[PDB]
Amino acid sequence: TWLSDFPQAWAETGGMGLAVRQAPLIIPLKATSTPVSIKQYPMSQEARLGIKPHIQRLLDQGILVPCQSPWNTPLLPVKKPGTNDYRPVQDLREVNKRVEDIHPTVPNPYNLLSGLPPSHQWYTVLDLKDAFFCLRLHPTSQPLFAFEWRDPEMGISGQLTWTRLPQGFKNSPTLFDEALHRDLADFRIQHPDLILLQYVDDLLLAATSELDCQQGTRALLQTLGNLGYRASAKKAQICQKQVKYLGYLLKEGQR
Amino acid sequence: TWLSDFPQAWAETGGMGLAVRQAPLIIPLKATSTPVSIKQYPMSQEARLGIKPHIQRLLDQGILVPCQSPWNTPLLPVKKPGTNDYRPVQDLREVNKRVEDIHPTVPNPYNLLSGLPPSHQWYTVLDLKDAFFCLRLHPTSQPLFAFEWRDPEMGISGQLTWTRLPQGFKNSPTLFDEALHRDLADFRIQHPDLILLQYVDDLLLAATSELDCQQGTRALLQTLGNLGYRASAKKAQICQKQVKYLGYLLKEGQR
DNA sequence: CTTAATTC
DNA sequence: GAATTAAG
DNA sequence: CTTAATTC
DNA sequence: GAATTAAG
Numbered sequence: 332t333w334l335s336d337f338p339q340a341w342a343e344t345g346g347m348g349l350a351v352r353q354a355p356l357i358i359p360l361k362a363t364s365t366p367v368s369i370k371q372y373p374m375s376q377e378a379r380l381g382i383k384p385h386i387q388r389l390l391d392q393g394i395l396v397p398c399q400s401p402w403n404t405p406l407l408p409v410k411k412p413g414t415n416d417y418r419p420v421q422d423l424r425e426v427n428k429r430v431e432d433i434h435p436t437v438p439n440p441y442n443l444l445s446g447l448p449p450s451h452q453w454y455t456v457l458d459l460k461d462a463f464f465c466l467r468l469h470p471t472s473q474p475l476f477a478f479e480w481r482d483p484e485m486g487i488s489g490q491l492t493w494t495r496l497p498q499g500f501k502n503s504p505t506l507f508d509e510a511l512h513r514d515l516a517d518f519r520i521q522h523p524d525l526i527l528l529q530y531v532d533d534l535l536l537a538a539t540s541e542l543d544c545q546q547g548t549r550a551l552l553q554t555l556g557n558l559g560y561r562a563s564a565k566k567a568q569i570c571q572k573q574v575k576y577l578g579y580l581l582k583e584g585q586r
Numbered sequence: 587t588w589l590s591d592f593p594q595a596w597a598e599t600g601g602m603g604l605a606v607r608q609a610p611l612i613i614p615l616k617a618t619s620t621p622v623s624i625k626q627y628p629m630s631q632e633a634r635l636g637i638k639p640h641i642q643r644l645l646d647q648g649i650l651v652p653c654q655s656p657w658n659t660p661l662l663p664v665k666k667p668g669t670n671d672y673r674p675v676q677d678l679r680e681v682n683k684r685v686e687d688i689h690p691t692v693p694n695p696y697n698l699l700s701g702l703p704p705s706h707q708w709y710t711v712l713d714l715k716d717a718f719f720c721l722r723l724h725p726t727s728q729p730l731f732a733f734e735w736r737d738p739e740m741g742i743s744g745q746l747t748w749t750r751l752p753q754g755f756k757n758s759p760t761l762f763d764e765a766l767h768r769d770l771a772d773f774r775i776q777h778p779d780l781i782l783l784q785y786v787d788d789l790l791l792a793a794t795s796e797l798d799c800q801q802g803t804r805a806l807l808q809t810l811g812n813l814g815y816r817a818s819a820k821k822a823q824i825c826q827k828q829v830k831y832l833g834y835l836l837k838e839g840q841r
Numbered sequence: 842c843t844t845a846a847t848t849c
Numbered sequence: 850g851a852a853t854t855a856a857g
Numbered sequence: 858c859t860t861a862a863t864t865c
Numbered sequence: 866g867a868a869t870t871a872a873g
């Protein structure tokens with residue numbers, strides 16, 4: 332039972348993650364940047380009610396906190412399908428434009444897979460849940476991502492902001508990838524015979540045999556949980572000779 | 587008096603031209619071409635009355651003649667300005683597409699003028715009137731350019747066609763330029779010290795002195811008239827140190 | 842909603 | 850230019 | 858008028 | 866795609 336053996340490693344049973352070994356991130360602004368405060372376009376009650384549960388959960392989790400900031404960006408009413416299903420989506424484009432660029436270090440899937448040797452055909456694929464949220468944001472950089480929030484009655488003071496790396500921020504993917512690489516460096520050293528591919532929050536572990544993959548997967552899950560990351564048990568593909576990774580179906584050494 | 591000295595050379599007094607030394611032109615068709623007969627779109631009476639005088643003049647001049655041809659292209663109602671002023675314009679595009687291409691030998695004005703030496707600053711500019719019409723078309727090629735014509739009453743039988751190189755034909759400019767070059771070859775040989783630039787029907791004669799330009803112009807006018815070409819006396823610029831040629835103003839060796 | 846490149 | 854698409 | 862590339 | 870331009 333992979334589930335009961337690693338309670339801390341799975342998002343379903345280990346609680347929200349927090350990368351304890353990573354220092355809170357400081358987000359450098361471009362040399363000429365000054366705060367921008369964009370007005371929140373009026374949100375319908377339907378949208379507000381749909382978003383409310385998520386905001387409260389994030390507040391309870393400490394991922395969102397009240398604040399007064401010179402920065403402010405819009406929250407928009409999203410619902411891809413059309414019937415119900417709401418989720419808060421922040422338009423951080425004006426913030427992104429004022430943040431210093433960093434080199435794009437995440438490899439494209441095609442090149443990443445070129446590092447998969449035919450000798451290793453036993454795989455385990457894991458995707459980390461709420462990955463960006465596991466990385467803390469330094470208090471100095473938190474004001475940057477503020478947005479407005481309120482309830483027709485006893486609504487929050489005014490603004491709320493993120494204490495963790497947020498969705499919609501241009502550097503989140505790269506910063507997360509680099510952080511996890513730092514945290515998994517030792518694991519790679521302790522398991523020289525295993526192949527570990529990282530694409531932001533999507534991991535592929537490859538071994539030469541089922542046994543090696545089993546032992547390697549136990550070690551990786553143990554390490555991820557200890558570091559504060561959380562993998563999706565529901566979507567995990569453990570020790571299979573056929574797996575779906577980054578849109579590809581890895582089979583018979585193909586793809 | 588340049589006018590009375592060369593009666594035959596000027597269009598105003600020498601009658602319609604005819605290049606007597608040039609064999610009637612045969613127009614080769616592409617290897618897969620077959621005749622195309624395009625219907626004449628109904629012409630308003632206003633247009634017909636405006637065009638009629640020109641058709642009659644051309645018929646009287648023998649430039650247009652009755653015919654029965656498998657080829658037929660449209661005549662359109664033209665009048666650039668808007669009030670009156672009509673002229674027959676034939677849409678020969680479907681004929682052009684079926685005629686074999688020839689190398690474009692007419693130089694562009696820019697390069698043509700590069701052959702004008704600073705040593706020759708006395709000029710004479712002449713433009714030949716109804717130049718294309720001076721070149722006969724071989725009877726075998728005449729049917730190619732047929733079009734319909736008629737009068738609400740005793741109108742012409744049906745079709746009319748050209749016995750001379752027509753306007754709107756893709757190769758007329760090049761064929762005329764080459765023909766005149768053949769006819770003026772001897773003149774160039776007899777006058778080595780003169781510079782003669784030809785751009786289809788626009789000629790520029792350049793000499794080192796007023797006297798040389800005067801003598802050269804007399805010889806050129808005499809030669810052109812004898813060959814059957816006709817220059818516009820109204821637009822002629824004779825022995826001037828400043829002239830307008832091909833859109834350029836030639837002055838102080840400039841342009 | 843807003844900012845914007847794609848198509849037509 | 851206006852409609853269609855994309856994405857924060 | 859018809860055929861067509863340019864712009865918007 | 867529709868209006869604007871060009872040219873036989």
Ligand SMILES: Cn1cc(NC(=O)c2cc(NC(=O)CNC(=N)N)cn2C)cc1C(=O)NCCC(=N)N
Nearest residue numbers: 844845846847848849850851852853854855856866
């Ligand atoms: C890939 N892509 C195709 C499109 N749009 C289309 O393909 C497209 C545009 C149209 N437009 C019309 O039909 C216009 N009709 C009309 N004016 N009568 C029809 N289609 C199928 C937009 C984008 C796109 O990426 N847009 C977002 C660019 C960005 N802001 N980064």
Ligand SMILES: Cn1cc(NC(=O)c2cc(NC(=O)CNC(=N)N)cn2C)cc1C(=O)NCCC(=N)N
Nearest residue numbers: 850860861862863864865866867868869870871872
């Ligand atoms: C050089 N040139 C410019 C144009 N047209 C334009 O410049 C032009 C096109 C438009 N179009 C519009 O305004 C369209 N408006 C709209 N659909 N609401 C405005 N202008 C100024 C056409 C040609 C041209 O050469 N056409 C003939 C090509 C040929 N058939 N050989």
